[PDB]
Every structure is written in C-alpha cells, then in structure tokens.
C-alpha cells in the first residue's frame, strides 16, 4: 500500500539531491538545501510535531544560489550557523562537471562561491571530513578520493580499485573516513596517516550507497543491488543482516538521526515510480512504503522522525510513527 | 630413448623389411639430451617432431620439441611452462592483507579448488561454489586469526602482522598442495590436428603456439644468440 506523503512542499524545479542540515544552526528551524537543474536553494522547515504553532509544515525559502550545472550531492558543513549576532551558511556542492562549488555566504548581501577542480571523473558523493569543516571529502568516477581543504588545495589523494560512490565521516571517532567503492567493498581511511585502517565487503554488487549510524557509531549501512546490508563492528566483515529492499534497485542508504533502528532505503528512478522503503530492523517489512514518481535524494532529520525526497518540483516528507 | 646415467640420447629408427623377411634398423637421426630425468615422450610423424617432457634438478617442469629431419644443430625448441605461484605475496602499506591475498589465491589460473579445498580441511582439523569457497577461506582465516589474537589491546601494526602471518601460512599451505597437483605425469599429441597436451595429475594443459615478439622476448640468452634472421624479417 503506497502512503501518502505526511508533507507536500512545491519547488520551482526537479530536485535532484535534498538535504537537512545534520548541525544545530541556533534557530528554531531545521534548514534544508534542495540542489535542482541549475540551482541550490537554502530553506527553513518548521514542523507541526517540532512547534504546535506551526500547521502543518512552514517551509521558508532563505536564500537561492544560482548553480548553472546540475547539483548531483551536497554536503552541509558545521560551521552552518543562523546566530543573529553572526551568520554563515557554508556547503559544498558537486556538479555534473566534476567540479566542487564552495557556497560562503551571511544571510544578507555577501554570496561568494569557489569551484575546485581536479576530478576527472564525475564525482558521485561529497562530505565534509573534518569536525571544524575545515576539509572536504569527494569521491567519483575517476577511482579516487580527495580530500580538499577551503582552498581548493587536494590535501591527500586515495586511489580506489572501483567508482567511489558514497563518502561518509565517522560521527564520533576523528580521522576514520568510510568510503564505499562500486565493487561492494567499503573501506575505511585514515586521515593521519592516510593509510587503509580496515576493508568491508558486500556480498551483492554494485554498492551504491553507505551511511554511518549517528546513534550506534558500530552500526553500518548500505545498499548493493536490491538488497540493504548492515553491518556491525568491531566483529566482522560480513553482513550481519541481508534483506531485500526494493524490487529494482536499492540506490541511496540512509540512517535515521533520532533512532538507531530506523533507516531509509530509495529505490531507483526507473521503470516504477522512485519507491522509498522506510524499514525497521526489527520488523521484516518496511514500516511505511511510499511512492514517488521521479525522486532522488534522501536526507532524515536531526531530532524528529521524519525523512525528505525530492521529488519532481516537489518534496515529499514521510513521518516514521515510532 | 637410452637412458645414461651422464647424458640421455634420442634414437629414431625406421623399420626396413628386406626381401627375405629380414628386418633390420635404418638409423635416421640421434639427438643427445642435459642431465634432465625424462618423464615422458611421444613423437608425431606429420611434423616430424619429438615432444619430450623433462624434471630438471630442481624438480620444475621442463617441455620441449625438436625436428629429427632438420636437426642441423641439435637445438631443443623451448616450451615456456607456466611457473609455480610464488611463495611470497608482496603488499604495499596501503593494501589490506585479506584482500590481497584473496585477489592472488582466487585469481584465474593461480590455485586450483582442489588445493583449496584441501588447504581449507586441514586447517580446520561439499561441493562449495567458488563464492562460497571464498567466504568459507576468509571465515576459516578470520577464525585462526581471532585466536592468535590473545589480548585485548593489540596495536594495529601488531594485528597487520598476525593478518599478514596467518593469511601467508594458509597460501603456503594452498601453494604446497598446488605443487603437489602441479607434478606432470605424461604428454598427449594429437596426431591429425598436432593438439598437444601436457597432463598433470591435477589438470590437464594445452599447449599452444607462441607469436616472434614473444618468442624473442622470452627465450633465454644462450638460445637467443642462435635464432634465424632469415625468420624475424628477410
């Protein structure tokens, strides 16, 4: 039974990557950067659940910034705050040119943006890899991983045996960055010593996706093929639990930010309308299995159980009962 | 073949019947033979070759082929034998030891799933599929591992070391059992086709042509000096 979505925002564009803001700002609302065809627009999503004021959801659009290419992942960094007193919004955006988009910006007037190149392959996700969000992890196409600083200047370069598809820093422990290749093999670098701590490995290929789990650092998961995969370390590299999640393919992974059971899994814009399995891991159906016709992007949010996807010009929020 | 305890000789007779049903050896060609022990051998008459299968002292397979009619220089023909695995894996500080000895054992031609299998009975004391041979080595391996690790605190250069350790016993243990399956036992030539095979007692190899760059490039130095430039280019 598909499920409606809770929330129905509309935009002026197909979103093509939507994400929460994963960092406390200092304002009341959580912020949200849908990235469409040629555009990033910062917003302010204020829920019914959050403040009893609000009906339903308020979504504010604070500031748009003009892309010019497609924005394909984008990457919130800690230093994002909306204090009165002094303001920043700073993301990093990449785009269909294989290029990273550095957006500084205060809220009033002062929009300034940078574009580091390097890659000569698309680049398929990127975070930031440092808790002052001083670095800027990417991985692509081109079977490696930068590590790039504010600017623009590659700090450290690991060579891949497969397409990098999902970068992702450990949420407590410093210096571990999890990067999963193509081929299912998921590894783990350090940013010291730049050196291969340890190497995961799925049993389905390809390895689309892979996400930490904020809750339980020991908590790994991903999607390769139809199939979502967890791990849990320090124990093994095999999965620990293997149960398909879409009929077409699984392709974006992620874990919820309030529990440490809940994750989302999206199925791929394809034959069927983008699906988005919401599953438990407890339970061996999904909770709540909603439709979306053309949807990419998957972000959930910080404190209240609620995930996004961008669907065409709209955003669709589903809230997961606990 | 005779058979010396100094130097083996090729003989190749052909058999004449006189009128008076007298029989008596015509001698066509003697080719002498190194101190290698001969295992077997078997000549064809559309090529006019004699395929002969060597041990040499160090108990690798040696093959080689010479024309008895156009023996002007009584050279053996090489026949460049794959070479056993070796018996140390080289790994970058970059590369997980697990990984890399998985691509070495469970790449194409390398191991066969006999000496797998075997290597995996013994250390622990069906007719798997090779993926699922590959998880039951890495589990096996793990399992050896966890119990080498005694304390809690192991460094991570120390655990490294007990992966690399416990991850190149078992390769060994594979590589031994590969020599064993790798011993040649006899050759096979087709006569009509000229198919020539050479039997192991694990498997079974053919054995085909080789182009002139890779025939220059890989034929050792003393025989190099002796190849026709009348063949390479006019």
Request: aromatic residues 10%; hydrophobic residues 40%.
């Given at each position: ?18 994400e929460f ?145 999902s ?42 996706s892979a996400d930490w789990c ?7 998961g991903?999607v ?28 974006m992974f992620r874990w919820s930010k309030?529990?440490?059971?809940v994750f989302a899994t999206t ?9 988005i399995?919401i ?18 992007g998957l972000s959930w ?6 995930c996004v996807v ?13 | ?234």
């Open positions: 039974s598909a499920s409606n979505a809770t929330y129905t925002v509309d935009c002026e564009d197909y979103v093509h990557v939507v803001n994963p960092f406390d700002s200092g304002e009341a609302g959580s912020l949200l950067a849908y990235g469409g065809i040629s555009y990033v627009v910062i917003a302010s999503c204020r829920f019914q659940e959050e403040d009893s004021t609000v009906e339903g959801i308020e979504f504010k659009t604070l500031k748009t910034f003009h892309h010019g290419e497609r924005v394909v992942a984008i990457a919130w960094s800690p230093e994002t705050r909306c204090d009165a007193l002094l303001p920043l919004l700073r993301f990093a955006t990449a785009a269909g040119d294989k290029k990273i988009r550095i957006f500084t910006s205060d809220f009033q007037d002062k929009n300034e943006y940078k574009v580091i190149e390097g890659h000569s392959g698309y680049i398929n996700d990127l975070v930031f890899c440092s808790p002052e969000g001083t670095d800027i992890a990417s991985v692509g196409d081109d079977h490696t991983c930068r590590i790039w600083d504010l600017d623009g200047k590659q700090i450290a370069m690991f060579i891949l045996r497969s397409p990098g598809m970068v992702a820093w450990h949420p407590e422990g410093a210096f571990k960055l999890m990067v999963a290749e193509k081929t299912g093999t998921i590894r783990f670098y350090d940013l010291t010593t730049h050196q291969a701590i340890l190497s995961l490995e799925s049993v389905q290929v390809p390895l689309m904020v809750r339980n650092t020991l908590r790994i991903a390769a093929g139809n199939d979502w995969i967890i791990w849990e370390m320090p124990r093994s590299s095999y999965p620990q639990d293997n149960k398909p999640a879409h009929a077409d393919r699984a392709r309030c529990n440490e059971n199925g791929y814009p394809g034959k069927m309308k983008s699906q399995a599953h438990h891991l407890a339970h061996p159906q999904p909770i709540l299995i909603g439709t979306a016709p053309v949807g990419s949010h910080r404190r209240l159980p609620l961008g669907g065409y010009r709209k955003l669709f929020f589903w809230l997961t009962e606990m | 073949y005779l058979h010396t305890p100094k130097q083996g000789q090729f003989c190749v007779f052909q058999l004449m019947c006189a009128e008076s049903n007298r029989y008596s050896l015509d001698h066509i060609s003697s080719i002498f033979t190194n101190q290698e022990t001969l295992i077997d051998f078997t000549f064809t008459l559309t090529s006019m070759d004699i395929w002969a299968l060597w041990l040499d002292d160090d108990n690798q397979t040696v093959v080689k082929h010479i024309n008895f009619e156009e023996n002007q220089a009584g050279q053996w023909n090489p026949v460049f034998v794959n070479p056993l695995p070796e018996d140390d894996l080289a790994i970058s500080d970059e590369q997980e030891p697990q990984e890399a000895y998985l691509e070495c054992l469970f790449a194409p031609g390398r191991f066969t799933i006999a000496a797998v299998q075997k290597a995996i009975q013994i250390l622990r004391k069906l007719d798997l599929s090779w993926e699922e041979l590959r998880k039951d080595v890495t589990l096996t391996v793990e399992n050896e591992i966890q119990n080498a690790v005694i304390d809690y605190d192991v460094s991570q250069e120390e655990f490294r070391q007990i992966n690399i350790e416990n991850w190149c016993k078992f390769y060994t243990c594979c590589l031994q059992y590969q020599e064993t399956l790798s011993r040649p036992l006899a050759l096979l030539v087709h006569p009509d086709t000229n198919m020539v095979c050479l039997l192991r007692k694990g498997f079974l190899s053919f054995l085909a042509p080789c182009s002139l760059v890779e025939h220059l490039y890989l034929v050792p130095a003393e025989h190099l000096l002796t190849v026709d430039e009348s063949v390479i280019s006019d």
